[PDB]
């Protein structure tokens, strides 16, 4: 896929001392994310990640009139004691990373948005090890054994998607880049939360040790290597 | 057009004290703006403005990965003893204003870009009275008599289109807004230069006193009223 050799790819290393503070970056607005138990949601092992299909009505704004609808979320992870986040911070790789993918409300279809500036926006958060079991993540992690096989799927009860995300929606980094998988389309607005979310070590081991990929392989280390900024400046919403 | 009643319209009153310094805003870059004299360009009195249609190969970048192609430029002006810029600065209206309209390289056509985030980008500079005849502007202004009638046009030799803009491409305001004529589509990135361009009093009088519009009326005061920011924050490339 020649687009994977484009100049403005993701993921990148975030170097906060080189980030550009702009006070124009307002707190993220996420409405309609508190889903009721029904209808249930499709959870799928697609061989590259585990992907949760989101329903209509999850509305997100990166700014005044810059609105988005959530399509899906998925994760990137490592292996036994090996971190697998996509973004890094000053060369540090975190245990895992969640991506919530959104479509601009200026586009009816994903295929129209691919390669167009701001057509797609991803909310990204690092997952770290903490002492407590995370209830929000347990709702998904507890269903991975059902979909251990590549290509399998199941249905899960609706859940509060926003509970999967960090505490402070006013503190993030932002830049324009690409999908981290083929077709590697550019024009994707990446927003990476400053703060992380915590999962227990058992939960992180469950994420990385349960699913199978293409052939006899485990579905692990499903992250792309770091790409150069090529002159892009990462913005920060805080001084 | 219902988009002329959107919340996020242009032009606006720029209040520099309320602008957000964003050091991610680097100097604008232009390529191919220095045209040979042939082929000639078309200069049209369209009844709302005087418009110069630009040829293919004029590239503009707002930053790394934010690439555009120039389509046309046009002017907004007042009348004898009355300023007619569209944008204002702290309530001050300037004698006239130039707009150079560009299409994102993600779109083959204007109608695909309308209403899409960053689909269109305009470079705007204020025109003020200086002591000298501006020789680049004289190439256009010396032809207005040929196109005095509404709907008339004439061919003009190619020229250095960048010579109609300020030499300082580092200091500017930037915000997201709309077209200022129907359909008033939103998603337009407006860049307004700090530095102004100087025309002689005679040039400014030629601009405002030569062209006729729709009816038996002079084409004058062809600016839209300022529109509220409505919570948008204007960014500045300098503190
Ligand atoms: N990080 S990411 O957002 O680029 C991304 C992956 F890395 C993946 F591994 C996957 S799963 C495998 C599908 O090829 C994914 F769906 C998304 N997101 C999809 C978003 C919708 C756009 C087209 C389909 C592929 C990317
Ligand atoms: N300020 S502006 O950029 O909105 C604008 C005017 F104010 C005008 F008065 C005009 S005059 C002719 C159209 O009625 C104009 F062409 C443009 N620009 C055109 C850009 C070309 C692409 C969209 C089609 C029309 C707007
Ligand atoms: Zn991803
Ligand atoms: Zn205009």
Author numbering:
A (entry chain A), B (entry chain B): 20 to 50, 50A, 51 to 54, 54A, 54B, 55 to 72, 76 to 82, 84 to 125, ...
Text of the article:
Human carbonic anhydrase IX (CA IX) shows limited expression in normal tissues and is significantly up-regulated by hypoxia-inducible factor 1α (HIF-1α) or other alternative microenvironmental factors in a variety of tumors.
Therefore, the binding affinity can be enhanced using inhibitors with the lowered pKa of the sulfonamide group. Introduction of fluorine atoms that lower the pKa due to their electron-withdrawing capabilities is one of the choices due to unique features, such as high electronegativity, small size, low atomic weight, and contribution to increased lipophilicity. We expanded this strategy and created new routes for functionalization of pentafluorobenzensulfonamides including para-, ortho-, and meta- substituted fluorinated benzensulfonamides. The bulky hydrophobic groups at ortho or meta positions are necessary for the favorable hydrophobic contacts with the amino acids of CA IX binding pocket. The sulfonamide moiety and trifluorobenzene cycle of all observed ligands fit in the conserved region of the CA IX active site, the cycloalkane tail moieties were guided towards the hydrophobic part of the active site and moieties with terminal hydroxyl group were located in the hydrophilic part of the active site. The sulfonamide amino group formed a coordination bond with Zn(II), as observed in many other CA-sulfonamide complexes. X-ray analysis demonstrated novel, previously unseen conformational changes in CA IX active site due to ligand binding. Our compounds exhibited high affinity and selectivity towards recombinant CA IX, reached nanomolar CA IX-dependent functional effects as well reduced hypoxia-induced acidification in a variety of cancer cell lines.
